[PDB]
């Protein structure tokens, strides 16, 4: 209603005298470390419940209908997960059975350490692509050609199918172990803010580039062509050029089958997504299309007659655990860091989505620890890095999922698919498994449709999306992530280095101050010049602050003093022989400052000194308490620059100046 | 005196209606480029006067009194320049002949393009070290040993004295040209803010740690030992251990003569600096100690009898210009960027010191063009990077210097020191030249005495100093600079990611709001909770902003709504069978925000949504005009979240709530 106040003009000291402060809390390092480590059983029970969240959702079960919901979600997600694992096994250059292995053990491990309920841990297209890329870069194909086979002219250097898969599996296991170690280090040290740097446009561009590279790889697999494992800089462009040059050496049957299953899967998925109001449970198109592909490929001998590319390499059994070949962490540390951070980011995103959809809370450090333990346990069983696919996750959520029991049942399907089920999958073409991956790329390919939206929105974030999407295409995929985080931090620094300063003026008959570049009917005080500067002054925006002051006052505090001294020597010689007109004061509305960066408080004191010589007072308006306490420690309040120069509000400085002019002409 | 106002409670729309805004300026890209490129004669005269500042101070000269002060300072700095020029040549692994070339040619170029008057362009100890650092790595000693000389058992692979220097000289010429190009790029593209990242602790810790590497490198010449040109990681640490292992192979003639001039030069310099009130002109101790060293070394045959290390390689002549060996810019791009940025940083640092004392303004972007052409012109005459030494600069200023005429006269002394003078410096020991450099290291060695001062001051800047000083010792010297620039920018991100949020309360009978953790007698409104959050919300601190709200209200907006649904299912079944107590509203005092980072503004709309369901209003207090215009563009003002939720001041949000509850119970 009515905003009326009546108080004296407390600038800095008229308010600090009669206001008793609170004594700061004593450090007492010994008592701090003693009180932190609790001794009562309550803290122990709390950390046990937090570290192992399985003991929370288990006692409060609702078996009656939860059993049926979990068993149906488990069989469905198990089928989907074994299909996605045997499909993504090609993305990591590993055999098919190791995909099923990586789809079984991480599920078992993410049961006594996970803190979620609607997450299906398993393989992931982006993570498997990164694993395959780093394996190809660390173990290419031109390093295994054994000369044997009595060739035509030179030694028969044929393909090394065989022991090469063992080396690739050992490399993938070492990579998974290093990723798990990095995740456990990040979780134990309670450092979780390191993944906050992955902004939405950054991860969007990264996923778009990863989807492009996955499309290129799966198109290479469908066409059944052999490239030269180009990796490094412009690897995707090089392999695409090589594919376009090797179009003649394709397979017509494999290409036709792949295009047909792509069209069928895309049409069925679009029909199920659009017409959701008629069929709530998503039709498992992957399962039926894989079954019909295996049925068609088994009838006619596509391997011999049509020379199709089938798997025919399923051992259908387990294997004893193998110790990882430790010693390759130095050359894969950055790759493992990138894989771990992107996996954790995707996992946290999916968890937060499916948690705010179901209204429950998911811890971050607990998810980090759970995924680290899962990757470590997978490294001992010849598996790759595990994550949560958005397509596989939606299955247990749509079909009905309440706890991780549906996830544990999803491993039983993979369990029976490791030992017995799988012999019918022998004549399955590799182009069919390479197609569902492309069909799942529709979710990430549509992410490009937000760049025009981000351009109308904050434009700095629209540049981060395009920069990350392009830079993660030229120089690899893992190196493109590091070039995105650094670019995002640089963009953040540029937004606090080049602020939006204004020409704050006074609104008549009130005390609210608005910018002069936005409103017209604003009257500024006679002689006084007000200035606001956001983005607290640090070592980078000090010259910017100087230029802003020089632009808002009209002149320069240095050149005016130089001209005054040049005109003063003419006065000291006349006795022997015989600009700063409008600016009366400068009120700095430094209310948007947080830190001071003493390198900057030195420049502030220099400004106050330079303007004092030309008889121009530099008052402050909205200096915070935690900023004044910092400036006082940095040696700013000398015998001449007292606290009376600072004020509490913007109108207090103007009122004090008006009263000083009225009382002193 | 009296601060009293009387205005209605204009929240956001009660103020926006009757306040007509100013129309934004039209872009008009066609006219923007036309109005920028002016055609009048004033624009042509302005660019020529700025690019060539010689036409300014030359017409208004004061030959009557200025020429007398320049002729005495020119011959003074000419003797100091020819000695420091040839002494710093040892730090660049080039012969002593090319040291004088870097003291004559850059002065000629920095005469028609320079925009300063008290700067003596020439070599520099820190800059010449970075130049010589890459020469040892790109052209080591073990790459030129020719087997010849009928050795004892194997081929006589002795030293390659002779054409070995030609590989280092041509390498230094290409490095000098690449540095000059980078400086012209920064000056041509008008990008000068890139050197603002070199903060005071950053450049302070860098020059301090560089003084150690200069001390270790020059100590090798004093002791006259031969190391294994260790470069890379821990280069200073590795070469320091090898010196201690090679103490037995020292030279008593070079050590005694080297240690003697160290004490003499240090004592006279310290004595003249303290007792300045008796002798204003600094005594050239560097010059007098060199002349007496050559006289003693010429009398007794120290080269033959005492086996001392002398130069004896001065041809005393010029050479035709040699085209730089283009093709080495690819492997020296990262190295030249570190040298080009420190050559400009020290130039402006020393320049601005002698500029505020003489009250003349030095152009910023012009120094990039001035030193840019200087290094390019020096590359065509086999020179290294040119800079301005603080010791050599103080000579021409203390003895009397007004313009660059004293610098041009200083080049005349160097001019005669190449054609005629120089033969007397033949028996000069290399330990004497390597000692005057160590004596000048006192200025940088005393920079360590500011770390306890910076610790009592802003502690984040004290960490950057120690981090830069340590990191520039482990991984080289040029790589340590890049590790300091990234760490300094990272510290800025950490200061805006972890802000200093408070519990803002109300002062009785007034309208000023202060933090509750700093003052005691502050009364908060009944039910209302106020929160201030500096460091504008971006993608990194958006999660910390959630934890900040949950900490100031006591509860969580998510778990409370979850328990409400858990308690609501018991209500919908009872009809079939038969927390948020204190927080009434939340006033966010977002007055210290500058940008939005729409990635983070999506959470602001989510926060209002999460609190609206639990019947908790989230009001804003001090949203700026340029930030409110950003929310509307980012899609924040929907049909439910109107502008009435925002307020102009902090007290307007509280005054509105007091009247709302009073009129609506
Ligand atoms: Cl997916
Ligand atoms: Cl010096």
């Amino acid at each position: 209603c009515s905003y009326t106040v009546s108080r004296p003009v407390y600038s800095e000291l008229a308010f600090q005298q009669q206001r008793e402060r609170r004594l700061p809390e004593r450090r007492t390092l010994r008592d701090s470390l003693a009180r932190s480590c609790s001794c009562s059983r309550k803290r122990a029970f709390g950390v046990v419940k937090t570290l192992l969240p399985i003991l929370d959702w288990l006692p409060k079960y609702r078996v009656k209908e939860w059993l049926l919901s979990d068993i149906i979600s488990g069989v469905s997600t198990g089928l989907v997960g074994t299909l996605q694992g045997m499909a993504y096994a090609l993305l990591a250059a590993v055999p098919v059975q190791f995909g099923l292995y990586s789809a079984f053990f991480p599920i078992l491990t993410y049961f006594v350490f996970g803190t979620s309920r609607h997450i299906s841990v398993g393989p992931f297209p982006v993570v498997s692509l990164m694993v395959g890329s780093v394996v190809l870069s660390m173990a290419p194909d031109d390093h295994f050609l054994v000369p044997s086979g009595n060739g035509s002219a030179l030694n028969s250097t044929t393909l090394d199918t065989g022991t090469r898969d063992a080396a690739r599996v050992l490399l993938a296991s070492t990579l998974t172990l290093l990723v798990g170690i990095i995740q456990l280090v990040f979780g134990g040290l309670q450092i979780g803010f390191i993944v906050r740097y992955l902004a939405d446009p950054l991860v969007g561009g990264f996923t778009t580039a990863a989807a492009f590279q996955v499309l290129v790889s799966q198109l290479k697999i469908v066409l059944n062509v052999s490239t030269k494992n180009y990796n490094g800089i412009l690897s995707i462009i090089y392999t695409l050029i090589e594919i376009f040059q090797n179009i003649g050496d394709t397979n017509i049957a494999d290409f036709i089958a792949g295009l047909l299953t792509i069209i069928v899967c895309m049409a069925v998925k679009e029909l199920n997504d659009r017409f959701k109001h008629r069929i709530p449970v998503p039709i498992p198109i992957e399962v039926i299309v894989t079954i019909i592909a295996t049925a068609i490929s088994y009838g006619a001998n596509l391997e011999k007659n049509y020379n199709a590319g089938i798997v025919k390499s399923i051992p259908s059994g387990f294997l004893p655990p193998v110790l990882p070949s430790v010693g390759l962490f130095s050359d894969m540390l950055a790759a493992s860091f990138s894989i771990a951070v992107v996996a954790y980011a995707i996992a946290v995103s999916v968890g937060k989505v499916y948690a705010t959809k179901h209204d429950y809370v998911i811890d971050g450090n607990q998810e980090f620890i759970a995924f680290g333990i899962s990757n470590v346990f997978s490294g001992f069983f010849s598996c790759f890095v595990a994550t949560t696919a958005l397509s596989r996750t939606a299955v247990q959520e749509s079909t009905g999922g309440k706890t991780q029991v549906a996830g544990l049942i999803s491993a039983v399907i993979v369990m029976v698919a490791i030992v017995a089920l799988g012999r019918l999958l022998e004549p399955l073409q590799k182009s069919v498994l390479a197609a569902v991956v492309i069909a799942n790329l529709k979710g990430m390919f549509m992410q490009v449709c937000d760049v025009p939206r981000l351009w109308k929105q904050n434009k700095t974030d629209a540049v981060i999306w395009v920069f990350t999407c392009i830079m993660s295409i030229i120089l690899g995929l893992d190196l493109g992530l590091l070039a995105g985080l650094l670019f995002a931090l640089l963009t953040v620094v540029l937004r606090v280095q080049f602020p939006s300063w204004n020409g704050l003026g006074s609104v008549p008959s009130t005390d609210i101050y608005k910018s002069i570049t936005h409103y017209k009917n604003l009257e500024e005080p006679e002689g006084v010049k007000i200035l606001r500067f956001s983005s607290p002054i640090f070592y980078g925006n000090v010259d910017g602050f100087k230029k802003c002051i020089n632009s808002t006052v009209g002149f320069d505090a240095i050149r005016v003093y130089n001209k005054r001294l040049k005109a003063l020597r003419r006065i000291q010689k006349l006795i022997k022989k015989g600009p700063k007109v409008p600016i009366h004061s400068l009120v700095l509305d430094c209310g948007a400052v947080s830190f001071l960066d003493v390198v900057g408080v030195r420049s502030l004191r220099m400004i106050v000194k330079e303007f004092q010589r030309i008889d121009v007072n530099v008052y402050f308006a909205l200096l915070q308490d935690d900023v004044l306490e910092k400036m006082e420690q940095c040696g700013f309040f000398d015998d001449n620059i007292r606290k009376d120069r600072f004020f509490l509000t913007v109108h207090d400085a103007i009122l004090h100046l008006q009263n000083q002019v009225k009382s002193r002409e």
Side-chain angles (χ1 to χ4, degrees), chain A residues 1-25 28-29 31-34 36-40 42 44-573 575-665:
Chain A
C1 61
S2 181
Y3 173 79
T4 167
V5 298
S6 299
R7 62 178 181 90
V9 183
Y10 301 147
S11 59
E12 182 61 31
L13 70 160
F15 179 77
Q16 202 73 13
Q17 290 177 0
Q18 68 282 354
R19 223 68 59 180
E20 51 275 1
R21 301 183 67 260
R22 298 179 60 91
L23 64 157
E25 60 280 355
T28 321
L29 220 292
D31 181 70
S32 70
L33 61 89
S36 300
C37 179
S38 301
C39 187
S40 60
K42 180 58 76 281
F45 178 79
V47 301
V48 165
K49 181 66 62 178
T50 302
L51 187 60
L52 284 75
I54 180 183
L55 304 179
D56 190 11
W57 47 268
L58 185 60
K60 57 168 179 292
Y61 213 81
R62 291 184 176 90
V63 195
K64 180 60 180 300
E65 68 284 348
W66 282 17
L67 186 141
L68 183 60
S69 66
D70 288 328
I71 191 71
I72 188 263
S73 297
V75 294
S76 184
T77 49
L79 296 179
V80 176
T82 186
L83 289 182
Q84 290 184 0
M86 69 185 305
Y88 297 154
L90 303 180
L91 285 174
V94 299
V96 58
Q97 62 277 13
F98 297 92
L100 280 73
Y101 294 157
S102 181
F104 176 74
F105 298 98
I107 294 188
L108 296 185
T109 313
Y110 191 71
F111 191 80
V112 300
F113 296 109
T115 177
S116 180
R117 300 180 179 92
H118 295 172
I119 289 184
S120 60
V121 55
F124 195 85
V126 177
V127 182
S128 300
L129 171 71
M130 297 181 64
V131 170
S133 179
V134 303
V135 164
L136 291 173
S137 65
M138 199 61 60
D141 196 13
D142 57 353
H143 198 273
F144 297 92
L145 48 151
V146 45
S148 292
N150 57 267
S152 60
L154 73 161
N155 299 270
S156 181
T157 59
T158 57
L159 191 56
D160 198 15
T161 299
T163 61
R164 164 175 164 264
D165 90 317
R168 293 184 175 273
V169 162
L170 264 58
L171 184 58
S173 62
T174 55
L175 180 76
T176 312
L177 180 65
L178 186 53
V179 168
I181 290 180
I182 292 181
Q183 291 183 355
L184 288 182
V185 167
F186 284 163
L189 297 182
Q190 210 69 19
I191 166 180
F193 63 95
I194 192 179
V195 304
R196 301 179 182 178
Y197 298 151
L198 285 78
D200 192 11
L202 198 156
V203 69
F206 181 80
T207 50
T208 299
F212 267 92
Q213 295 185 357
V214 164
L215 174 62
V216 173
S217 299
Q218 302 295 264
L219 183 60
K220 177 184 61 61
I221 293 183
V222 164
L223 295 179
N224 194 90
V225 300
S226 60
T227 54
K228 207 178 300 301
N229 55 88
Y230 288 152
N231 198 326
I233 310 301
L234 293 175
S235 60
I236 169 181
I237 301 299
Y238 290 161
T239 188
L240 184 59
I241 292 300
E242 189 176 8
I243 290 173
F244 284 160
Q245 291 180 356
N246 299 332
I247 295 296
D249 299 1
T250 186
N251 194 331
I252 48 179
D254 294 330
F255 172 77
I256 287 180
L259 181 60
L260 180 60
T261 181
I262 279 289
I263 293 180
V264 168
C265 183
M266 186 62 59
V268 172
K269 183 63 62 180
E270 187 69 21
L271 186 64
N272 180 268
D273 192 10
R274 178 173 61 258
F275 293 158
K276 183 62 64 180
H277 61 273
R278 58 176 183 91
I279 301 297
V281 43
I283 167 71
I285 171 66
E286 274 66 280
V287 180
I288 179 61
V289 76
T290 303
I291 289 179
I292 193 60
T294 53
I296 294 300
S297 180
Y298 182 81
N301 195 331
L302 269 61
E303 171 69 289
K304 183 181 62 60
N305 300 330
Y306 296 155
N307 198 20
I310 64 179
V311 179
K312 69 178 182 180
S313 180
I314 301 181
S316 68
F318 282 93
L319 79 170
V322 182
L323 288 314
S325 180
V326 55
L328 300 178
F329 298 155
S330 59
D331 42 325
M332 301 188 304
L333 210 287
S336 298
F337 170 80
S338 300
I339 292 180
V341 67
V342 300
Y344 180 74
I346 297 175
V348 168
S349 179
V350 174
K352 291 302 179 181
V353 168
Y354 287 85
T356 191
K357 190 265 175 180
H358 197 264
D359 293 358
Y360 63 93
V361 187
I362 294 183
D363 199 333
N365 300 119
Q366 183 58 30
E367 287 289 342
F368 229 150
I369 292 295
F371 276 97
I373 298 179
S374 299
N375 298 332
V376 167
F377 184 83
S378 309
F380 295 156
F381 286 85
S382 301
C383 305
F384 49 86
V385 184
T387 332
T388 159
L390 183 59
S391 60
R392 183 178 61 258
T393 299
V395 180
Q396 59 182 186
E397 177 267 353
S398 54
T399 58
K402 307 300 296 181
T403 53
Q404 293 292 151
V405 177
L408 179 61
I409 299 174
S410 175
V412 184
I413 302 301
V414 186
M415 175 62 181
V416 77
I418 287 180
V419 43
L421 180 60
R423 192 58 180 267
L424 190 141
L425 305 178
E426 186 268 353
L428 176 57
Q429 289 183 147
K430 300 175 60 180
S431 301
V432 180
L433 297 178
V436 294
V437 188
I438 299 181
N440 293 130
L441 297 181
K442 180 60 65 62
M444 291 185 295
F445 279 153
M446 292 294 101
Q447 294 183 353
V448 195
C449 300
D450 80 328
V451 187
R453 178 57 60 91
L454 292 180
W455 188 261
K456 302 181 60 180
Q457 296 178 358
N458 178 268
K459 304 180 182 301
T460 62
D461 294 322
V463 180
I464 301 179
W465 197 101
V466 182
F467 187 89
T468 306
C469 179
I470 292 181
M471 209 58 56
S472 47
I473 288 181
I474 299 179
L475 37 143
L477 185 59
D478 49 71
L479 250 300
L481 175 77
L482 181 61
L485 297 173
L486 298 181
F487 181 80
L489 297 182
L490 179 61
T491 306
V492 170
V493 172
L494 288 180
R495 290 199 294 262
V496 304
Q497 187 178 2
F498 301 93
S500 59
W501 55 276
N502 297 323
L504 267 285
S506 180
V507 180
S509 180
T510 53
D511 64 328
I512 177 62
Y513 290 82
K514 314 301 294 179
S515 177
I516 198 60
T517 61
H518 295 353
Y519 298 91
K520 179 180 300 300
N521 296 19
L522 301 188
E523 52 177 7
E524 56 183 2
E526 193 260 4
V528 187
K529 204 62 174 297
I530 312 178
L531 178 68
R532 178 178 180 87
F533 185 82
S534 303
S535 300
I537 308 177
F538 62 101
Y539 64 92
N541 64 335
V542 41
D543 301 331
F545 186 66
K546 281 289 301 179
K547 184 179 302 301
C548 167
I549 289 189
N550 296 12
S551 300
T552 193
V553 307
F555 58 88
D556 197 334
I558 294 299
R559 296 192 301 267
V560 168
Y561 188 72
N562 292 11
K563 295 302 179 180
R564 280 297 180 179
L565 287 193
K566 186 178 301 301
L568 183 61
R569 48 91 182 183
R570 285 296 303 179
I571 304 300
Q572 64 181 0
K573 65 181 300 180
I575 56 180
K576 181 179 58 60
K577 177 182 178 60
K580 52 184 180 184
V581 180
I583 298 304
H584 180 211
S585 299
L586 179 63
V587 181
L588 297 184
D589 191 7
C590 299
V593 294
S594 61
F595 57 93
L596 233 285
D597 190 11
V598 55
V599 191
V601 87
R602 298 176 181 177
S603 179
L604 287 183
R605 184 172 58 91
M606 183 60 60
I607 291 174
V608 176
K609 239 61 179 180
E610 291 174 0
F611 277 88
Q612 185 67 24
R613 302 179 302 182
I614 58 180
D615 194 6
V616 176
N617 302 19
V618 178
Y619 294 159
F620 299 87
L622 292 174
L623 261 290
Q624 300 81 355
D625 300 355
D626 201 10
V627 183
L628 290 179
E629 293 290 340
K630 199 64 174 180
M631 294 178 60
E632 184 176 0
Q633 297 176 0
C634 295
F636 183 83
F637 297 90
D638 57 76
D639 197 14
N640 180 267
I641 305 178
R642 300 179 302 272
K643 290 183 177 299
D644 208 340
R645 190 169 301 272
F646 292 79
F647 292 85
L648 285 183
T649 60
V650 187
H651 195 202
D652 288 1
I654 304 301
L655 230 301
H656 179 65
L657 277 168
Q658 291 178 183
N659 297 331
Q660 183 178 4
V661 171
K662 180 180 180 300
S663 180
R664 196 273 303 270
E665 300 292 339

